[PDB]
Scaffold this active site. Structure first.
Site, short mmCIF file in Angstrom:
data_model
loop_
_atom_site.label_atom_id
_atom_site.label_comp_id
_atom_site.label_asym_id
_atom_site.label_seq_id
_atom_site.Cartn_x
_atom_site.Cartn_y
_atom_site.Cartn_z
N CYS C 151 0.84 -1.18 0.00
CA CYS C 151 0.00 0.00 0.00
C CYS C 151 0.88 1.25 0.00
O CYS C 151 0.63 2.19 -0.76
CB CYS C 151 -0.94 0.00 1.22
SG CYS C 151 -0.16 0.07 2.85
N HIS C 178 0.14 7.07 8.89
CA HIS C 178 -0.68 5.94 8.48
C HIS C 178 -1.81 5.55 9.42
O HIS C 178 -1.70 5.68 10.63
CB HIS C 178 0.29 4.76 8.29
CG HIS C 178 -0.22 3.66 7.42
ND1 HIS C 178 -1.27 2.85 7.78
CD2 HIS C 178 0.23 3.20 6.23
CE1 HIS C 178 -1.44 1.92 6.85
NE2 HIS C 178 -0.55 2.11 5.90
#
Lengths: 332, 333, 337, 333
Positions: C151, C178
């Site tokens: 990702c 994140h």
């Protein structure tokens, strides 16, 4: 094509707008808020809980241009000088909270708007309507009416169903509610003097009062004074659930209760048997969504206590109801 | 016994009062706030992030009675109208954030009241800014109004200074993953400041945001003036922050040297760890800044280096502890 | 139409499945996961962050009926026992995490099986790492197993790429603010991987965490090999992330120059914006990375410059969108080995 | 005096340990857990919800050195292989959740074992359930294995018994707005127990969930057997809970009457409060339950009454406090 005019572009106002873009017979032709248009345009485009705007928003001189269609945006401080008529506004959604009275509200009506749906509570002059529950009380001669509260719109279809099928003696309501904009983001002085709304809203379970407890009698007369409740604000930005522990004039089973709710289902009152959670109701159109999995019917020594639960997006559910009441009240 | 007066009983004001309770030689004898004493009392007793007050708090005539001691609570709109003297206050902690100039702050200072003032914010042109244990040695005692810097500056200062004293700093960028603050909206709504990002639900978003700590670090460390810049990312945590500094130094270094140097610079204001701690672990600490050796980085590419140093801090309590140290010191100078 | 098979119906597999419903030339015809079908069907209809499923889902004999279409759902422990061919599956998305090697991944490629496999894990030796629209040009179709990166990499790559192609990168440090993930503990407890930070309550802390994106970015952009490194700070957001790159360039630049260049490199995998958006605004986006021109910084001090570029990305749907775009391509550039 | 042994160093076990550090006459001399000692030591020092450890924790050969005292830390999988007797362990806090039965928890009783066990979960048939200060008087002192009930039971019990002893309970329904716990998924995914609701992100949802405290309240308050049933709503708070009970009574009552009855029943396990507190104000308290008079409701509609009482509680620390209160009594009994 019912032409709507929105006054007050807060969470409810902006969501009202959005919801109208999905309803056929209705469309907004004039918005009036005191805030800077660029600010309002940004908030309409980007929404934390309701997601990005389905379309495009561009600021223009007179207002905005939403999906190749200009929408006038004014910043008038008084209902008096809001020429809704110029834009063809026949119904006004009053959601600023500063015109919660029969008088204040009527100001929007000159020649000028024709009818006004208030977000705040009614009083002597104003009728309180929870679409698909009691919008039948409207005859057409009304000028100003109330769309009631977000909690009332959740409790009404459910309580009415219990009343119509078994008859309700009395009951207590508890709503595990999402924190709202009137709570402090961090511990501080709540300008309303509320020692609980002064606490950090997204970091606590906060007990808080509710109005749907008594006001329920204004929507369902036979329940007047029969219900009372409170709420528990929790760390969820939107999405709520109402628990009603009642005592009935007749004995029942879980299946009977669940069945009756399913029978009472429509566009405003939905029905599920899926083990859903809060997030699953963000953005629904039902003003209330019964949850059969949470039903309870305790029997001890021939006496019963019935528990029924309904989920609702305190934001979009409530808004969907307001939009439905608008289109109907306008066509009367 | 240094007698303190607090103007503005918000997060800082209240935590300042709290800290003072564990600092022998310092007492707060007066609080000036426009809020209903009952509201304030309640907020001092119960605190979501910093815990229950350690003791008793009662609303009495004229003020509070905290742990057997009386504290006058006044609600004057104008600083010049606060007679700090009648309560023996010799030094005022300007914590309303409404006054950040030598002129505005000096109002506290007159004969009917204050003697010295410490503003909890960048103080203007004629005001020295002090981060305790980093540059408080610049106080000669004659100054009237001083600044205790900001919560971010107090975290950044000791860390950046250690880099300057040991290796020399050429330039650097800073990012602070900061807890959300009362400055942000709880739910999407018009922000009174016009800030389109602070207008977003603070506890439900990573919110980019400007800051001036790195830009005005020169007021604390003249040699770094104009050498640092930064921004922040506000996140869904009620208190607790981390400041990452990426910079270029004059000397080449290793991860080991940078860490060793930081450790040597450790004191009551600047802490040091090698434990893989997380944000909640620093909530309520006394260090104005806590260096984290596990997050250090020294990247060497073709002879050139980028050094990344990280420091934790409770944007609330770390800052508050620093403000009290300065109050006490300034008062006794 | 490219017929895809998914192995592992976790956050990645389920979202890949939803994304495919909005991609014309692709469809899923076989799902393989060891979880009870009913549980999976439920998690597919309801999603805390990506919302309610767009349509209808029902548990049927041998699988599900999704939007009027039957999808077989098996629970084979070994890839060798999955007759992907039966359902017409030509390409498999290996997302269970238990077959991250070329040898293990090829077990899907047997006679009564699939032709190509795309793992969601990192690649390396005999497995090419691919970030669609950045380096998918390195595929010739003969490959058997490829990786769709992580990702984080799918976010960083297009951004770092632009910096390289336009100005040349010397070196840089990256930090990703994140969202918390499934490998973190919901409450303080023994983390099975022995990690003392992922052992802490993920939704109540700012948690330092190590990523490999920056290090292995060379696998995607050879020139930048060894030139980048970084880490992450997990924060209390169920999904949605942001990557900040800080670097030194071969030449001097201005904010306008940098932003303009990013805008020029924009496509379906790399969007460009100038609105002061925030975290929740990129949840569910199909961009693999969304450059934010409002966070760019070009600091010039004593003649030297530090450049700062930031890109948003939904660590879930952005990554998922990139995998689907890589699955489709790899499937049609596919040449029988 | 009383040396306690802990089997299972998870949330309940680590808290019991902490809580005991502040209890005179009770010391933990042996800890048994399958987890790596360094990970456990770290989890003891740092705690997101309960804060930093009050003191010092150091990993030593074969155990930890906490505040100067060594504690043995073993990792035996079978209760029969733990020589509790070696360390002077007379009583054992069974919190692994794998021996929640008399015959299993008894494996702790042998030569180099203990003499008594307290399991932190519904114990089984031949095991007594105990909520200190409401029914520990049922302990004769010759029982071998007992249960400290559940976190919700220790909250509901005193409040529920106060209503029974004061007005007589007909029936009632409970609803706990509970903090999310370790059995919920941090993000949506397959729940090991097949539960479709616990499979959802627990820190991002209101999650309906079944409970058993109400349906098994009779094991603690006999007269109430089968008269209570409940459920819970897990909300996004790492710790801190509140129990709502709606019931019908044998007598007509008023709000004041109910609150007064609660206050009269107050003690170390059952607190009383009229301050409009919030959940975070409850984190870390020692009460097993805290009645909130500000939430009392007594509805009267046509002669019939529906009574609603509420109690806050830290599902972690309140329950832990109860466990050690029981551990101490049981051992001395």
């Amino acid at each position: 094509v019912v032409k709507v005019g929105i006054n007050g572009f807060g969470r409810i106002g902006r969501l009202a707008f959005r919801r109208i873009q999905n309803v056929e017979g209705v469309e907004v032709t004039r918005i009036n808020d005191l805030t800077d248009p660029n600010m309002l345009a940004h908030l309409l485009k980007y929404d934390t809980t309701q997601g990005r705007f389905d379309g495009t928003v561009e600021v223009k001189e007179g207002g905005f241009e939403v999906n190749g269609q200009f929408v006038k945006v004014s910043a008038e401080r008084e209902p008096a000088n809001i020429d809704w008529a110029t834009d063809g506004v026949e119904i006004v959604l009053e959601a600023t909270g500063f015109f919660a009275s029969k008088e204040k509200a009527e100001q929007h009506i000159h020649e000028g708007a024709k009818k006004v749906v208030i977000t705040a509570p009614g009083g002597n002059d104003v009728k309180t309507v929870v679409f698909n529950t009691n919008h039948d009380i409207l005859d057409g001669t009304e000028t100003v009416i109330s769309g009631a509260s977000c909690t009332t719109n959740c409790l009404a279809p459910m309580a009415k169903a219990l009343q119509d099928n078994f008859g309700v003696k009395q009951g207590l309501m508890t709503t595990i509610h999402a924190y709202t904009g009137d709570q402090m983001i961090l511990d501080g002085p709540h300008r309303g003097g509320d020692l609980r709304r002064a606490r950090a809203g997204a970091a606590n379970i906060v007990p808080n009062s509710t109005g749907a407890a008594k006001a329920i009698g204004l929507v369902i007369p036979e329940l007047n004074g029969k219900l009372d409740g409170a709420a528990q604000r929790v760390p969820v930005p939107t999405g709520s659930v109402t628990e009603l522990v009642a005592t009935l004039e007749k004995d029942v089973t879980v299946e009977e209760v669940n069945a009756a709710m399913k029978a009472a289902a429509n566009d405003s009152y939905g029905y599920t048997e899926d083990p859903i959670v809060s997030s699953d109701i963000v953005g629904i159109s039902y003003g209330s969504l019964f949850d059969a999995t949470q039903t309870k019917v305790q029997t001890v020594d021939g006496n019963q206590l019935v528990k029924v639960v309904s989920w609702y997006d305190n934001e979009m559910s409530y808004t969907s109801q307001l939009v439905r009441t608008l289109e109907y009240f306008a066509k009367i």
